[PDB]
Structures are given as structure tokens and as C-alpha cells.
Ligand binder design. Structure first.
Ligand SMILES: NC(=O)c1ccc[n+]([C@@H]2O[C@H](COP(=O)([O-])OP(=O)(O)OC[C@H]3O[C@@H](n4cnc5c(N)ncnc54)[C@H](OP(=O)(O)O)[C@@H]3O)[C@@H](O)[C@H]2O)c1
Ligand SMILES: NC(=O)c1ccc[n+]([C@@H]2O[C@H](COP(=O)([O-])OP(=O)(O)OC[C@H]3O[C@@H](n4cnc5c(N)ncnc54)[C@H](OP(=O)(O)O)[C@@H]3O)[C@@H](O)[C@H]2O)c1
Lengths: 325, 319
């Protein structure tokens, strides 16, 4: 039969998973599980909308639960909770807390005999796999990760907090010259300041002083003061017209040398019109591998490092060798 | 204790494994096995050089045997042979022939209980993994593979068989415009002539006829033949540089364009491939420790088994 999927949480990732399901005909969406009153939440797919408290009664109805909650607060609770009852996938993205989150999920999943793949997505996720592949294939070398262009919600909210700002969108952008230095094999040391520029689109409150606001943004400790920062004062119409998308991506580059001195460059990049749609497409693919692992009697927390790529595909191992190898 | 590696075949890849072992201090190179008289093959590492007939006797001395032979010429026999006695890695590159190769290796390795990872390298290998990932994450879209600019080792050796060719080096070269159309998200339709050019640098035998040699070379790609001196071929055409691109251009179910690109730029094609074989050798050793057997492809190898670092350390440092 089809692999049965549940969504927990109906935000951008949640919508992204519904859409990915449409691209993965071996998968069926069963229900969306929300913390909000379900009588009140509409979902584009028109499947059953249920409160998170009904989820346990769906244990025999759902093969993999895709957890589409936020990393700061939603996932720390929801990851361990849902891994008690289902195989799970999530996008947990706070790198520093990965080890603690893994341990928490793992406990749950080992107790339940379920597979929980944590931290799926471009970063962590696909960029991670490329960092790892780079260092093993080219052990003598340096890796550089660049992020964006994409919105930084934390920088956008810091701008919004400035008196005289009505609304704002801030973007992190890789610096092309630095990308190019890395591709050349020079192997400089590059900080985050050397790798990215910042660009801010800002709507003033009526009568606000643009010099003062731009001063407060460019001098803000931690957030902007040490980074090449451009500030554009624009209208709400412009922000709505041109800054409503959630584009994202960046680069992963390993520059290394053979033992004889040969420069070898590995470059992996992403250019995404939609961050959530891309992340969620990845989540569904991993869901297929968590289903497979579960059917083989596996259990416990996993990451992208533990998942053979063949299990991501609906194609037979034989057909993969024939078509893609 | 160290992972004990054996090399089978002292050619470009074999020198390349030697070099890659220097970079992987968890591994020790035990011996080079050759079909040539071992007294006549000098190896850079100065490890023991032995004839392939003595390999079976080293069954308990070697954890992974890295098979550095030619895909058409030596691997079809060597791969199944060695997989009777050792965990093996090889670089078998002939895509059309991988199913048969895989079944022949697979039947030896299943019977012996060894792990054999076949077809490890940039393509097949890393490019393959990117083609799979692109289709799995972006099911609606197109995948485009480009090779070069780099020396085509196979084509170069094919031109050297033509009468009146003293020597030659052929290049495969991706057409920049095609790569750029693909990157734009145009999803271009491209013929093979629109993706790659072929460029041959040929040194004629004293006496030969250019027009006859060119005809023989050219008679589906735009292929430019340059007749040059031995000196120019040495100065400017010495390297085995290679590389290429795997791009997946797709769309979300709502129409958003999503592009994934993987690329390589390699000063040494053999050195690179061999660095990959050694990483896989580590994974084969790990699968062997875990009770695994049979033939595997890159598709079957989780990336964490490639690293000498613990799973916990990987999660802390790289994820
Ligand atoms: N690994 C990666 O590369 C990667 C990439 C992108 C994102 N991510 C992660 O994905 C996480 C979620 O991203 P997202 O953009 O989906 O966040 P989001 O849109 O804010 O959704 C998060 C949660 O917010 C709740 N929510 C949605 N709409 C709401 C509303 N109108 N009122 C109140 N609550 C609402 C939902 O839970 P309920 O339905 O239960 O209310 C949803 O599960 C991020 O925190 C990020 O860490 C990871
Ligand atoms: N998967 C990929 O991405 C990828 C990339 C690159 C290459 N490859 C594969 O790698 C294969 C091996 O390539 P290579 O460049 O190492 O080939 P090579 O240099 O031609 O060596 C092949 C064999 O030739 C024998 N040999 C070496 N020097 C010799 C000499 N002077 N006289 C007689 N015999 C000699 C050696 O075995 P003995 O020591 O037993 O004589 C060696 O194993 C190619 O066929 C290609 O398909 C794969």
C-alpha cells in the first residue's frame, strides 16, 4: 500500500509537506495535527484536521509523522513526544542543541522501537552531508559554508524593534568575491563577516528620521556592526510585492589537495525560490527512508549521516544501479 | 589498530591510492599486488610488491583490497576474483555494464562473506549520489550531467590506436552556455552537441598524412583536431585534470523553481578517484565488522561510515 503520512503542525513546512505529497504518489497524507482548535484550521489538502491529543489514537493509521514545528520551542517537546508513538522526521535546526536533541529523541525512539530522523533539511541536512563528504574524500583541505541569499528572521526582528521602524525584511547574502577565492584553491581563513553581506528593506513609521534609524541599524552590536550592511527605505507595498517570498540556499565548498599537491575542489550549492517547499520535499524523501528502516526492524534516533541514499528513492536498488549509477 | 589495505594494480589509480593512504592515518598499506614481475615494478611507498598469485596467502593480513585496474580490461576478472578472498573496493566506470559486473561480484562476495563496494569514484560515485538526491528531493524537474573540462582518458587512448598517431590527448569540455542555461532554471532542451565539445591534440608520426588521420578520427559531438608537436603536447597537455557538474532543476508543486548543483574541479582525476576509494574502504571495513556481505554500490553506504570520526562527533562538528 501507500506509505501513510501525518503532519504535525501547519505552518510553512506543514504546507510544504502537503505539496510534496502531491509529488510523491507512493505516499498518502492521513491528517494534519495542530495545537490550535481544529474546528478552526483549514488545510489546502482537505484531509482530516485533528488536535495533537488525538494523535496517539492514530498509531496504527500512520507510518511516519513529519514534525513541521519550529526548532526553538516546538520541536524540543514534540520530537520526543511523537517518537513515543510513530516513526518521525523533523527539521531541527539549532546546531548547538543537536546533541541534546538527538539524545532526547533517541531515548524516546529506542523505548518505542520507532525510527526518528532528526535535522532533515538543507542546513542541517544536505549541506551537512556535503561537509562530511568533503572532509572524507579530501582529508587535507578546508570547508566553507555560505548561507543565502535568504531572509534572516532574527535580524529582521531586531530591525523591527528599532523606534521609527514599521516593518522590515533583512537578508543574508554570500559575498561572490569570497566564493570565488575559495573556488580558486587559495584557502584563506574566512569568518562569517568575510563570507556574507547584509541587506535590509525597511518601512519607516510616519515622520520617522531615516538617518537615525539607519544609524541604529548599522551600529547594532552583534547583529550588524561588523558586517557590510546596506539599508533601503521602502514602502509596505514594496515589501509586499517583492519581499514576501522565502527564497534561500547558499554554498558548501571543500578545497583540498592530493598528497602530490593537486588542487581539488568540491562544490555543492542550492538556489531555492522556496525554503519551506524545498525543506519539506526533503522531509518526505526521508520519510520514505524512515519507513524502510522501520520495516527492517530498525529503531532509534538517526540523522542524515546514517541514511543510505538508496532508501530515499521509491525505485528498487536494481533499478537505481541501472538508471542512476 | 590500523585498517590494513592492499592495492591491486599499480597504474594511475594505484599510485593515487598510495598517495591517499598518506592522508588517512587510520590506514596502513600492506602490499601492492601486480600481474607484472614484482621485481620490475617500483612503488613510491616502498611497501612490499608482490605478484597477484600470492594474494590469496594474504587473506588474513588485509582488511580491504582496493582494486585499481581498468574497468573493461582487468576488473571483469579481478573484481569477482578478489571478492572471493577479501572485502574489496573498485572504481568500475562502465555504466552500461554495471548490472552484470554487480551480479558477478555479488555472487563471489555473498559466497565468501566479504563486502565488495563497486563503482566508487566521481562518476560513477559522487555524481551518481547527486543524481539520486536531486530526483528524490525534486521529483518534478530535470537532471543534467556534464563532464570536464578534462582529459578523456578513454578517448585519448582510442585516438592513439590510429595509424600515424604518435601520441594524443583528447578533452571533453562542457559548453558554458549550456551550463549557464541549466543554472538559470530555463530547463533547456539540449542535444549532446549543445552540451559538450570534444577537442583532440594529436602528434603525427614522421611521415603520416594529416588528412587521412583527421578523417579516421572524426568519422555525436563537435570535435576539433589540432596537430601539434610532442613539445607542445608535453608543455600544455601533461595533466589528467577533470571535473563536471550534476544539476537538478525542479519545481515545487506550487511552481517555485528549486535548483541543486554539485560540481568538481580536479587537477588530478586519478588522485581524486583514489581518495574516494580509500574513504569507501573505511566504510567497507565498518560493514564487514557489522556482519555485512555482498556487493554494494555507493547508494547503499551511509556517509557516516566514511569518516574515522565517531557518529557522536559528526553530529557535534558537521551536522
Ligand atoms: N533543516 C533545515 O534546513 C530547515 C530549513 C527550513 C526550516 N527549518 C525549520 O523549520 C521550522 C518551522 O519552520 P516554519 O517556517 O514552518 O515555521 P512556522 O510557519 O512558524 O510554523 C511553526 C509552527 O507554528 C504554528 N503555526 C502556524 N501557523 C500559525 C498561526 N497562524 N498562529 C499560531 N501558530 C501557527 C504551527 O503549529 P500548530 O499548527 O500546532 O499551531 C507550526 O507547526 C523552523 O523553526 C526551522 O528551524 C529547518
Ligand atoms: N568511477 C570513476 O569515477 C572513475 C574515475 C577514474 C578512473 N576510473 C577507472 O579507473 C580505471 C583504472 O584507471 P588507471 O588510470 O589507473 O589505468 P592504468 O593506469 O591504465 O592501470 C590499469 C592497470 O594497468 C596495469 N599497468 C600499469 N602500468 C603498466 C605498465 N607500464 N605496463 C603494463 N601494465 C601496466 C596495472 O595493473 P598491473 O600492476 O597488474 O600491471 C594497472 O592496474 C579506468 O579504467 C577507469 O574506468 C573510474
Amino acid at each position: 500500500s501507500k506509505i501513510r503520512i501525518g503532519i504535525v503542525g501547519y505552518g510553512n513546512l506543514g504546507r510544504g509537506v502537503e505539496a510534496a505529497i502531491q509529488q510523491n504518489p507512493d505516499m498518502e497524507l492521513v491528517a494534519v495535527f495542530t495545537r490550535r482548535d481544529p474546528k478552526t484550521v483549514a488545510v489546502k489538502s482537505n484531509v482530516k484536521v485533528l488536535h495533537v491529543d488525538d494523535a496517539q489514537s492514530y498509531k496504527d493509521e500512520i507510518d511516519v509523522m513529519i514534525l513541521c514545528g519550529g526548532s526553538a520551542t516546538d520541536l524540543p517537546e514534540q520530537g520526543p513526544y511523537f517518537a513515543q508513538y510513530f516513526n518521525t522526521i523533523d527539521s531541527f535546526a539549532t546546531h548547538a542543541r543537536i546533541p541534546d536533541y538527538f539524545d532526547a529523541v533517541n531515548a524516546a525512539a529506542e523505548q518505542s522501537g520507532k525510527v526518528a530522523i532528526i535535522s532533515v533539511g538543507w542546513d542541517p541536512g544536505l549541506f551537512s552531508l556535503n561537509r562530511l563528504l568533503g572532509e572524507v574524500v579530501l582529508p587535507v583541505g578546508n570547508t566553507y559554508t555560505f548561507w543565502g541569499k535568504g531572509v534572516s528572521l532574527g535580524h529582521s526582528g531586531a530591525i523591527r524593534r528599532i523606534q521609527g521602524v514599521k516593518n522590515a525584511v533583512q537578508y543574508i547574502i554570500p559575498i561572490d568575491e569570497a566564493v570565488n577565492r575559495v573556488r580558486s584553491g587559495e584557502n584563506p581563513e574566512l569568518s562569517t563577516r568575510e563570507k556574507h553581506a547584509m541587506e535590509c528593506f525597511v518601512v519607516l513609521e510616519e515622520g520617522a528620521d531615516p538617518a537615525k534609524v539607519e544609524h541604529e541599524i548599522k551600529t547594532m552590536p552583534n547583529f550588524f556592526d561588523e558586517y557590510d550592511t546596506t539599508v533601503h527605505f521602502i514602502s509596505e507595498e514594496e515589501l509586499k510585492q517583492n519581499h514576501s517570498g522565502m527564497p534561500n540556499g547558499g554554498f558548501v565548498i571543500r578545497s583540498g589537495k592530493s598528497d602530490e599537491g593537486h588542487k581539488q575542489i568540491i562544490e555543492f550549492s542550492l538556489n531555492l525560490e522556496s525554503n519551506p517547499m524545498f525543506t519539506s520535499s526533503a522531509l518526505v524523501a526521508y520519510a520514505r527512508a524512515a519507513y524502510r528502516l522501520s520495516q527492517n526492524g530498525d529503531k532509534g534516533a538517526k540523522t542524515v549521516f546514517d541514511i543510505p541514499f538508496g532508501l530515499l528513492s521509491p525505485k528498487s536498488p536494481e533499478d537505481l544501479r541501472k538508471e542512476l549509477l
